[PDB]
Design a protein around this ligand. Structure first.
Ligand code: SF4
Ligand code: F3S
Length: 106
């Protein structure tokens, strides 16, 4: 499965949903996750993320391992998103800021 990590929070460009062939993304107020069981590992969404926040599970940085289980957990309770939307209001301000997990909204 592929996993959405920290830099997506407060950015949520959603440029990753249009190329997904199986619509396995689920959205929160300021973050998006990939459902591990529905994801077919096509890797097509990874280069589409301006925040470079997507990684295949085996490539998730050591300091962001928590996002693997987090994607699995939130994909179970959040609504499905299959269409591209406008990025969050101040996405550019937050793109690159570290430790944004502290700002994650349920
Ligand atoms: S790797 Fe492919 S199937 Fe998985 S979330 Fe990305 S675009 Fe969708
Ligand atoms: S910022 Fe998030 S919404 Fe998709 S394009 Fe990147 S994983």
């Amino acid at each position: 499965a592929f996993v959405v990590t920290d830099n997506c929070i407060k950015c949520k460009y959603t440029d990753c949903v249009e190329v997904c062939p199986v619509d396995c993304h689920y959205e929160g107020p300021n973050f998006l996750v990939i459902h591990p069981d529905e994801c077919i590992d096509c890797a097509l969404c990874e280069p589409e993320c301006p925040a470079q926040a997507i990684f295949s599970e085996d490539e998730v940085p050591e300091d962001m391992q928590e996002f693997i289980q987090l994607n699995a957990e939130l994909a179970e309770v959040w609504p499905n998103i299959t269409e591209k939307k406008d990025p969050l209001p101040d996405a550019e301000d937050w793109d690159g800021v570290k430790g944004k997990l502290q700002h994650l909204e349920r």
